[PDB]
Amino acid sequence: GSHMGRRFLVTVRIQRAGRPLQERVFLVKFVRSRRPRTAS
Numbered sequence: 001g002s003h004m005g006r007r008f009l010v011t012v013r014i015q016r017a018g019r020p021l022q023e024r025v026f027l028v029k030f031v032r033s034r035r036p037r038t039a040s
Contacts, residue, residue, distance in 0.1 A: 015022070
């Protein structure tokens, strides 16, 4: 299908409000592998 394209954001938005401590863990994994992205 097409849709708007914001279904993935809805899931993450709910997690951000879930538990307080958690974003710190994501930063660790994100920082551990920091790399930009380019279109193809």
